[PDB]
Design a protein around this ligand. Sequence first.
Ligand SMILES: [Zn+2]
Lengths: 146, 46, 49, 54
Amino acid sequence: IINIKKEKRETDEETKQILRMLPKDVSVAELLRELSLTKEEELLFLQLPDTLPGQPPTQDIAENACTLADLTEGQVGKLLIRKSGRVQLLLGKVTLDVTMGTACSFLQELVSVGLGDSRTGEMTVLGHVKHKLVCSPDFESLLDHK
Amino acid sequence: DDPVVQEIDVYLAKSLAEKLYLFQYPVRPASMTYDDIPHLSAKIKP
Amino acid sequence: DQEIVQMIGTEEHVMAAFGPSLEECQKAQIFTQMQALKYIGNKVRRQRM
Amino acid sequence: MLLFCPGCGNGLIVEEGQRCHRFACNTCPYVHNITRKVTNRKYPKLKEVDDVLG
Ligand SMILES: [Zn+2]
């Protein structure tokens, strides 16, 4: 029997129903093992808030939503890992917090669909997505500040 | 609790802003991938 | 059906309880959205003409 | 147990082919022959030796 086309168990984390013979991680230890334990690159999928703490630069406006489509390239923020497991994102004067999202176990392929021509385009499989991050405003600090 | 280690920088790229899609298979576990499956075509609408 | 079972739950007792429903569904020839919609419409009565 | 086809995701039943018993789906030609023993225990609750009251 073919080994890469066996039947799959309902539990996606325990699909190994037949053999030839997971604790919930944290973002700080995740990045630590991604950089210290290994050096291989990894593709992440983080969810940013609706409005970023910035203004659309010369985008013809109004206090509207400021997403990544308005910001330019270059360094836009820093990622801080404090003690006791704190993982913050300093995006300027404010600091958000980054937590682990829903642990997806199904296949997630990050691909690039580039329509170079109006009749023929190219689909480029960039990689696979395994972990999901969630960035949230530190509302407690924003409230105690003013 | 000071930021002792891992002061990672965050960069932004706009090259594939309009060409980046996310395809997720709710019925296919992450263990088995479609890398070995020969694809034939893809229909799409802008 | 795998997506339905995932949506219901991944607990062993949940699958054991939901098994009869999947078996009864597989007894009939309902496997697409059109067939299920036709089966539902067959069970629909007009509001008195 | 409950098994599903990797192709379409429908439930798999157990039938008999031309060589051996196999799992098969009713909506696709996908099959899977059984090589070794497969079991699914449930471990039902054993009625306890009820105490004599009164
Ligand atoms: Zn199938």
